[PDB]
Amino acid sequence: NLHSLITSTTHKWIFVGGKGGVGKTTSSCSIAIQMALSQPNKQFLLISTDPAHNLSDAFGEKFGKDARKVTGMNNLSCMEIDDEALSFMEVMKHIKRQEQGEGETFDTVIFDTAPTGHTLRFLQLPNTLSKLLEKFNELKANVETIRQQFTDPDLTTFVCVCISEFLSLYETERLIQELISYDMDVNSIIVNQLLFANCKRCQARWKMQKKYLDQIDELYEDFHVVKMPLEIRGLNNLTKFSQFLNKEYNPITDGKVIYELEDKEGLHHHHH
Ligand code: NI
Ligand SMILES: [Zn+2]
């Protein structure tokens, strides 16, 4: 589970990459909602390159190229955006230089990467860029540093999200393998949509699920495996689902609590 980040005082950067709409936006939320909720004050500020903008949709408010902490959050702003490098670097330092001015420093960005998978290039711009310079000046020293500074794990940790389904799993295999080419921190991944222990005609789907869970256990020992039950829209609805993000969910709790949380969104059973 992700209490290492829910707590980590030391991180300036947290990328939640999860191209797939697997409530990835919701992961990003819950981590920021849970972090800021746990580190009572010390405003973290949440962006999502997500071209969809599910994030604004997520908290129940419309954000954009501007910060704006949410109603009830004494310590958490949000933000969203769309060559490709242009998009990144310029608008990347848009947020950087943007908050240098808006008042003072502000602690760290939950970076909900674009599901577009275009965020891959958004993540190697500086590497090959510092090359051009070293064999062709302010930002030049900056890139060599920040490039090593993104490499540095006690500052820049990535974090993937999954459904049980095998296909994601493979894209996550190939994904991480690319991430290490970058040489970035990664050791942590959350999974979604899990059912647990009538709706046994549903549990018959968790069966196949449960197994896929075990292929990721054995396959990744160096990593947290966050089993997350089951997209919400409210702040509270969202905040409660973060509570399971940090504190290891549990099928006695999970049970009574999520039975309540679905009966929220108007969901004598039935599938179809
Ligand atoms: Ni129906
Ligand atoms: Zn069922």
Curated annotation (Swiss-Prot):
Belongs to the arsA ATPase family. Present with 17300 molecules/cell in log phase SD medium. ATPase required for the post-translational delivery of tail-anchored (TA) proteins to the endoplasmic reticulum. Recognizes and selectively binds the transmembrane domain of TA proteins in the cytosol. This complex then targets to the endoplasmic reticulum by membrane-bound receptors GET1 and GET2, where the tail-anchored protein is released for insertion. This process is regulated by ATP binding and hydrolysis. ATP binding drives the homodimer towards the closed dimer state, facilitating recognition of newly synthesized TA membrane proteins. ATP hydrolysis is required for insertion. The active site is at residue 50. It is found in: Cytoplasm; Endoplasmic reticulum; Golgi apparatus. It comes from Saccharomyces cerevisiae (strain ATCC 204508 / S288c) (Baker's yeast). GO terms for cellular component: cytosol; endoplasmic reticulum; endoplasmic reticulum membrane; GET complex; Golgi apparatus. It is an enzyme of class 3 (hydrolase). One of its GO terms (molecular function) is unfolded protein binding. It holds the Pfam family ArsA_ATPase. One of its GO terms (biological process) is retrograde vesicle-mediated transport, Golgi to endoplasmic reticulum. Keywords: Arsenical resistance, ATP-binding, Cytoplasm, Endoplasmic reticulum, ER-Golgi transport, Golgi apparatus, Hydrolase, Metal-binding, Nucleotide-binding, Transport, Zinc. This is ATPase GET3.
